[PDB]
Every structure is written in structure tokens, then in C-alpha cells.
Design an enzyme around this catalytic site. Structure first.
Site, mmCIF file in Angstrom:
data_model
loop_
_atom_site.group_PDB
_atom_site.id
_atom_site.type_symbol
_atom_site.label_atom_id
_atom_site.label_comp_id
_atom_site.label_asym_id
_atom_site.label_seq_id
_atom_site.Cartn_x
_atom_site.Cartn_y
_atom_site.Cartn_z
ATOM 1 N N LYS A 1 0.806 -1.231 0.000
ATOM 2 C CA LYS A 1 0.000 0.000 0.000
ATOM 3 C C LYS A 1 0.818 1.249 0.000
ATOM 4 O O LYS A 1 0.240 2.317 -0.362
ATOM 5 C CB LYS A 1 -0.981 -0.012 1.184
ATOM 6 C CG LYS A 1 -1.999 -1.175 1.176
ATOM 7 C CD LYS A 1 -2.844 -1.182 -0.112
ATOM 8 C CE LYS A 1 -4.121 -2.055 0.132
ATOM 9 N NZ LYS A 1 -3.800 -3.282 0.890
ATOM 10 N N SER B 1 -2.323 -12.791 4.390
ATOM 11 C CA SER B 1 -2.675 -12.817 2.958
ATOM 12 C C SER B 1 -1.536 -13.384 2.116
ATOM 13 O O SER B 1 -1.777 -13.897 1.014
ATOM 14 C CB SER B 1 -3.069 -11.422 2.439
ATOM 15 O OG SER B 1 -1.921 -10.552 2.521
#
Lengths: 4, 305
Positions: free
Chosen positions: B45, B267
Site C-alpha cells: 500500500k 494474505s
């Protein structure tokens, strides 16, 4: 709930 | 080593790729992992936080000193907090009050302001409050699930990095967990163009398999499973979907830390599990690539470790  | 830079945001990107050696068999395809936690803020991100701020600056929608707002309990909040501190912006985040004290401490260490919303209202409450704050106060909202700069930065940077890293090799399959879908969509576009025979595979939680046509539900794969189809996801980009359960993903992240020395988040364990399943299907000599969005150090207080 979601973790974004 | 990179020549000195004037701003830490100039080191975002250019992340390394490691081949897996032990969690996948010699009978399966080669599996490579792109370490997006090597970005200076700790996750993929960083890329979209920089891109959304720089596009809004270039379009005159914000100027240094301005305040932005975003509803996020995850890595995008950390990314935006980091980028705003580096570039001279002020950040406000909304989020349910169930977020950990350490996670709050991280956002506040970059100078961000937090607005906590009722836990029972989860992300809906945080979204509602961010929109209210945007309209009351004139805040700029990056909107990570709609802003095209999100998939576009992956089309310009992450994807083409992979093309440079795999020159003289064919990538046979690229797999990525979908949160916003920007990674899968932008990387997938660039890889499909260069490698028209590649398979592109979306990964989502078994417990909330919305891309598969199922119903949203609670799940533990942090960074994935928004419960809806994001604006930033190109639903045409993937040829197939692999669903991963909570426990399966955590078991793989534990294996990969112990057996590869690569310490990554929940993840990432989902991505690697799916990539190994795909590698077994494609067999020896082929090339499978995926992305590890975040580092295991950010999860030491979760059931993962």
C-alpha cells in the site's frame, strides 16, 4: 469486518 | 545501493523477488514471490498511497498542508499515514473501535488523527463517517476502492518491474489476493500484454467468496475479502479464482517463515498456498509468480504467530  | 534521495517516498517500489525452495516440490513449477513488504512503509500500500496523493496534487485537488480522510483499518491507513508525513499532508482515518492499540500507535506515530466509529457498525460505520467528514470539512478522500490511480500505479510500476525481473523467462501464471483488486488488475494487465498465454488467478477467502458468486462473510485473511466487487478490480482480468480458508493460509505463512526464512502476513500465506496449488498443476519447468503484500512482524499479536 475487512482490514484493507 | 541507491544514490541518496531527498525524500523517503523516492524509495517506494523496486521490490525484490525470491524463488521458493522447500515448501514446493521439485515436481511442480518454480514459484517466485515479490516482497512488497520491502517498501519503506512495510506493505504494497505504499505504492497506492503515493500514487493517489501525487495524482491529486498534479490535478490541483490538494496542495501540501491539506488534510485527507480515508476509512481504513488496514495497510492502506498505514501507507497513507506514512506518505502524508513524508510529503507534508495531514491524514484523518476513520475505523471501527475494534482496532488494536499498537495499530493506533503506528498511525499516530506518523502524525495522523483517528476517528473511531462504533464496533457494531464495522466498516459500514467508518465509511459513513468518512463521507460525512468529507462533506462537512472539505477533506480530500483518496477512495482506494474507486480511484483509478490505484490499479494504474501497478500498471506503471509493480507490473513492469516484474517484466524486467523475468526478462528471458516466461511467466506461466500470476496469482494475487484481491483486496482493492488494484494489484491483480494492474499487474495482470501488463503481464497479459507481454505474455498472452499467461493465466491470471484471483485469490479470495473461502469464508467470503464474493468473486466466486457467494455471499460475504466474516473471515480472517487480513488485506483480502472486501465483501463486494471493488471499482478498482477489473473482473475480466482473471481466468480463475482460488478460494483459501483461514487456517490454510495461516499454516502456509508459518511454513514459509520456518522453511524459507520469509516472514509474511496472512494474505501472503494465502497467496503462496494458491501459487503452490497452481504450480503442481503446471508441473516442472514452468514459472508461477505471486505477491507478498505485508510482513509477518505486523501480525505478531494475531493467531498467525
Amino acid at each position: 469486518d475487512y482490514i484493507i | 545501493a541507491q544514490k541518496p534521495v531527498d525524500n523517503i517516498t523516492q524509495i517506494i517500489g523496486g521490490t525484490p523477488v525470491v524463488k521458493l525452495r522447500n515448501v514446493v516440490d521439485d515436481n511442480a513449477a518454480d514459484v517466485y514471490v515479490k516482497l512488497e513488504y520491502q517498501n519503506p512503509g512495510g506493505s504494497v500500500k505504499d505504492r497506492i498511497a503515493l500514487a493517489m496523493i501525487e495524482k491529486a496534487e498534479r490535478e490541483g485537488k490538494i496542495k501540501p498542508g491539506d488534510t485527507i480522510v480515508e476509512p481504513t483499518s488496514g495497510n492502506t491507513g498505514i501507507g497513507l499515514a506514512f506518505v502524508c508525513a513524508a510529503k507534508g499532508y495531514k491524514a484523518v482515518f476513520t475505523m471501527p473501535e475494534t482496532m488494536s492499540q499498537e495499530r493506533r500507535n503506528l498511525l499516530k506515530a506518523y502524525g495522523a488523527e483517528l476517528v473511531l466509529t462504533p464496533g457494531s457498525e464495522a466498516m459500514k460505520g467508518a465509511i459513513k463517517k468518512a463521507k460525512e467528514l468529507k462533506e462537512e470539512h472539505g477533506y480530500f478522500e483518496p477512495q482506494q476502492f474507486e480511484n483509478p490511480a490505484n490499479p494504474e500505479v501497478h500498471e506503471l510500476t509493480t507490473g513492469p518491474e516484474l517484466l524486467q525481473q523475468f526478462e528471458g523467462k516466461t511467466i506461466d501464471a500470476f496469482l494475487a489476493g484481491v483486496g482493492t483488486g488494484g494489484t491483480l488488475s494492474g499487474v495482470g494487465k501488463v503481464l497479459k500484454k507481454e505474455y498472452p498465454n499467461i493465466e491470471i488467478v484471483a485469490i479470495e477467502p473461502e469464508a467470503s467468496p464474493v468473486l466466486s458468486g457467494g455471499e460475504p462473510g466474516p473471515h480472517k485473511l487480513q488485506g483480502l475479502g472486501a465483501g463486494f466487487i471493488p471499482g478498482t478490480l477489473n473482473t475480466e482480468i482473471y481466468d480463475s479464482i482460488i478460494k483459501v480458508g483461514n487456517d490454510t493460509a495461516m499454516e502456509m505463512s508459518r511454513r514459509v517463515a520456518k522453511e524459507e526464512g520469509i516472514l509474511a502476513g496472512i494474505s501472503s500465506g494465502a497467496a503462496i498456498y494458491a501459487a503452490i496449488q497452481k504450480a503442481k498443476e503446471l508441473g516442472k519447468g514452468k514459472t508461477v509468480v505471486t505477491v507478498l503484500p505485508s510482513n509477518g512482524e505486523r501480525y505478531l499479536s494475531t493467531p498467525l504467530y
